[PDB]
Symmetry: C3
Amino acid sequence: VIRHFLRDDDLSPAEQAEVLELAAELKKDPVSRRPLQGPRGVAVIFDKNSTRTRFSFELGIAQLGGHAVVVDSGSTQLGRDETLQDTAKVLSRYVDAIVWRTFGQERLDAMASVATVPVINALSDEFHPCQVLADLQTIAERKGALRGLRLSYFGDGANNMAHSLLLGGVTAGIHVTVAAPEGFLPDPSVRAAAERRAQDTGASVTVTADAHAAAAGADVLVTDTWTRVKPFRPFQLNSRLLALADSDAIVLHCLPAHRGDEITDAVMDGPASAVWDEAENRLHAQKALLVWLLERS
Amino acid sequence: SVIRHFLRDDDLSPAEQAEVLELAAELKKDPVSRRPLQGPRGVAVIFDKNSTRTRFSFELGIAQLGGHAVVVDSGSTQLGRDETLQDTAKVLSRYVDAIVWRTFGQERLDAMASVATVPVINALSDEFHPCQVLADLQTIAERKGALRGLRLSYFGDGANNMAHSLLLGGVTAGIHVTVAAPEGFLPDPSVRAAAERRAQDTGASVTVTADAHAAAAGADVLVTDTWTSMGQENDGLDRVKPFRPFQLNSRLLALADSDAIVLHCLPAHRGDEITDAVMDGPASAVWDEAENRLHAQKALLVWLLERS
Amino acid sequence: VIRHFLRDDDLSPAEQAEVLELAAELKKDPVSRRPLQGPRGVAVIFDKNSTRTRFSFELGIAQLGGHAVVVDSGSTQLGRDETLQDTAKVLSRYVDAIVWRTFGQERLDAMASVATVPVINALSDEFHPCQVLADLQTIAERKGALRGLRLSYFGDGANNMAHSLLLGGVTAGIHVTVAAPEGFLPDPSVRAAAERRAQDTGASVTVTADAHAAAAGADVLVTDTWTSMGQENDGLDRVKPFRPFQLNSRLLALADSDAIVLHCLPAHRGDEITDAVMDGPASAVWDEAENRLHAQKALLVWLLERS
Ligand SMILES: Oc1cccc2ccccc12
Ligand SMILES: Oc1cccc2ccccc12
Ligand SMILES: Oc1cccc2ccccc12
Ligand SMILES: Oc1cccc2ccccc12
Ligand SMILES: Oc1cccc2ccccc12
Ligand SMILES: Oc1cccc2ccccc12
């Protein structure tokens, strides 16, 4: 009966809509929801540090009335001195949710199968579903309804943002295109899962090496750091590519950006950019996710 | 008032320990009902060697008392190196309402407590682990009722911090404590003598034996712990062969009273000092025991702050 | 207009007086001001860790109702995987103020020029203005009115405390003397800025190698460690030049009979200051360390209200 969020498709289309509505409500009234008043605890655990992820979760948990107990790298990695299952059993006595940044999906699934509190994938090798919640919140702010929009992601199509934009995007009814060079394409099982979910929402999945075609008529253009660099240079999100999009298109980028590589100063700082609101919305979207999971768990 | 500290289990009298354990039960029921640190007031939580489990328990506990834990971990300069211990104690006493400290030798705790003008708590040290034993006693009371006259046997390294604190804290509660350990691994004589003296006041007793089977027979509570701390991994000894007869396994548990429970300061090394079958069976109380660090430490802080 | 506090003279004499008054009020009533109720966040960022700085800000922010998000030097250094300007713009969405311990003053300037929330220098290579606020709070507690007092600093005359005592001291109307060996004198730009500020307040600036003359008649004697961690490999003998400038009992006896002694902790007993001075009745170092809490909270309250 305990709900987890390890990958974007763990929410149904209707559930994702609820979380995104909650994110908009919490952005307007950031201390109106206090499910963790007490304070109650939430564990925020990093096998590898991610300062931006820790910052967003730590403040968000505090604004829900709770106390984040943060476990950094440098500390004993989880599972090193104790079985994962033993640690999960005790954690479930101390905190009301477990937020975890680890690498393989195997470890996340193992924790979710045993823990009796919700487990959230803060960021992993395969998915980055909290950032895509924030992306979807950002798109809804700038454009309104998500269903039927065209979103193109450019660059490394095998990384966690590509996978999550596929799954999270089609869950929202967005037609998702991944524009990537050969050998950096989506994981085939992720692509299949997105194609299947798209059948329910009227969305679609496209994977192409043609950056021009992916930009043409796009409503949302996304990229992410590339880490040779040489296969990705034709996919740089520059002014020439942006000029092909639909009017009022917006540009997203999980920060940090490497200006001059995957994205140019002119695109980052121009009027289509929504990267600053997008970064802020990690706070609101993650708070919404926690509120929603806690209420069901 | 005199400033009260908690550096070893017998720093509380039997009556005082009963007061803390009663408060721990009350706080488990109503975890935000005591707010002596509302403000927030600060509490320093200092680690000469990091302990994530100890940190979770104190950080959350202090917050649930209304306070803010300021954590200093081993990445900072170790206390006493860039600044004298006495200088640090003086300034800490201006910033925080209590000092929680995980360190090594007991003389450091003593030095801090002699000069600090706020309560000092031993979070975990080489010689004692008195906060875990408060949680242990809370767990035993939950599972079995009155502590006085129970029989508790600890198995393994009889000179580690858990053996010492189970001796002192157990006999303070009126529990007859047995330590089952191989030769060369017996409790420190000064601790053993202190436990024997305290046991006279409570009607308890202290027993030290190498006969694991005899220690298990008739026991109400069986306890073990890892055989080797991190600081002993390079001590030169074979720290497996001596301890194998003291493993807390199903055969040993079956010698005890039919209603006996099992305790273990986590983490456990399954297959060494304890088996899966015992950890995961119905006698195991190790999960509640770990949770109860939260409640017992909150009770200790509330009690020390009120008396100081 | 967003106000920053990157160096001591970012506050006018009148503004400094307002902050120090607020520090005294907060010391009396430490949880009466809640501008960060929510909690709202405050970023506390360390390019090089300082446990005492982090300890005092983290608790102070909590007592203002906020939540300090501490970024240690274990994170990628600010400006390396992202431009400083980009990080500033996102931080302004997350927190109501940015407290930063960094190295060169140009980095602080760069952050303040683009951030839309107040930026505070927690401690830097050139200045330590938050500690000097705590010092002025401490002097006021022990001595009363600050105007006209005579303060002498001894030791490395070009470190952050020397610079901030010059700027913060003359802002308060204090006659500041820096006693230091040749080669270790205040930055010329800082000395000139202090000299100009002193003309507004009736204060004065003196730099001398004559430690005995600097101590004579002084109301406050200050010293600091002779070497920061970053100077340990600079090639200099950083002991022998400073020995004549040791704050010892002989030097203290030259000052006014009611003089007090300050030292940013930690101190190295036996080097820049002696046990007899640290532990005697003139020492104010313990109150001084505590007042980091109150003075920093006051600065935050004041900057948040004005910005
Ligand atoms: O990563 C860890 C190592 C050891 C103990 C832990 C307890 C809770 C959460 C994380 C832990
Ligand atoms: O074993 C553990 C795992 C995670 C958290 C803990 C807290 C206290 C005591 C033990 C713990
Ligand atoms: O261990 C330490 C090193 C440096 C500063 C400290 C301040 C408080 C408590 C502990 C400290
Ligand atoms: O010296 C110290 C020891 C412990 C805590 C401190 C906090 C602020 C300033 C100095 C401190
Ligand atoms: O230093 C940093 C590295 C990466 C991310 C950061 C976010 C906020 C403040 C500082 C940061
Ligand atoms: O890029 C950043 C700089 C500072 C803070 C951040 C927090 C969340 C996401 C991104 C951030």
